[PDB]
């Protein structure tokens, strides 16, 4: 037995323009970055650097 | 020398965040500009025994 | 603006996008060249 849930909400217009967001590691963690050119998404990188 | 795409602005859309639909209010009055950079494409391959 | 029609029979939702033709065909030519490697 399936049914739906409907919510009626106010409909204001807002300005909408995506801002770059950076992710940063929590204490105890680090991010390894693959610096190989043309990495292709999987497998080994032979040039690895560490960033927060 | 300009490829022009025809576009429409819609109010009833499907949601990318989950199964369901949502209705949005009618469009704002005018001069709406969206200048942007194409930085990549998402393609799928149509193969098969044929 | 100057797109105020609301109905055809009983245009506010009409919009368009421009792409430089020469950039797009060049872009695809490079993509195609890479697809050909596979």
């Amino acid at each position, epitope marked *: 037995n399936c049914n739906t849930s409907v919510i*009626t909400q106010a*409909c204001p217009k807002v300005s909408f323009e995506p801002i770059p967001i950076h992710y940063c590691a929590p204490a105890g963690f680090a991010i390894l970055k693959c610096n190989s050119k043309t990495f292709n998404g999987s497998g080994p990188c032979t040039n690895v650097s560490t960033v927060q | 020398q300009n490829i022009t795409l025809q576009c429409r602005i*819609k109010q009833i859309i499907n949601m990318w965040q989950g199964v369901g*639909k949502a209705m949005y209010a009618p469009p704002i009055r005018g001069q709406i500009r969206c200048s942007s950079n194409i930085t990549g494409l998402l393609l799928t391959r149509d193969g098969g025994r044929d | 603006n100057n797109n105020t029609r609301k109905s055809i029979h009983i245009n506010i939702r009409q919009a368009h996008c421009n792409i430089s033709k020469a950039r797009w065909n060049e872009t695809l030519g490079q993509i195609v060249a890479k697809l050909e490697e596979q």
Partner: antibody
Amino acid sequence: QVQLLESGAEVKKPGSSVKVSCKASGDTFIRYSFTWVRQAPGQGLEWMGRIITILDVAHYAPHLQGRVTITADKSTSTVYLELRNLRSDDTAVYFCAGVYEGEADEGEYDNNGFLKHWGQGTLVTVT
Amino acid sequence: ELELTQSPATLSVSPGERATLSCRASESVSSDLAWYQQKPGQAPRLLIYGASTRATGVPARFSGSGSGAEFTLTISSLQSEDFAVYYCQQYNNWPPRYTFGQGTRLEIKR
């Protein structure tokens, strides 16, 4: 664009239910919204509620929802107004009205409330 | 929700006179107030779509405007066929809480 054809008059003992129908013709029912108006004698145009046929949702005047529901039967292009627990207070001439919405099927629905297409008016009383 | 009221209860005019009808909105409705014409035994047919667009089929005699708490409807060169009750309707509601005013009756001066 369309004409709306309503059911006839009815009388019920208070507490009984009454269902009023409004059939639309000349366009696709799904394409646009319908509302109901209650012309009680001596009164103005009390709003009953609104039903959207592209999305099966409805809204009701805030004092009436305990008694009234609206159903859009897309297969018969007919809207039904159901009055539960009918009171003598609800004696009135009821009718539907349609509002054209653009290309609702394509998701270009306007959500207009301006009533252009009207029914005839059916008196509902109690006994 | 928003209450709409008519200024005159009725308005007595002569045919050929310009009718001047008005409606007040207690919550400052914005460009969401429509006008309708109801004749006895008839549905209250739309005259003005939104605050100022006459609906298709509406005679050029009918026009109106307004904003916020006050809106008007006028009928130039009023004809005998226009002695109807005019209604005020508001749409600035979401969730919908649409309302109508009481209706102003035109009277034929006699």
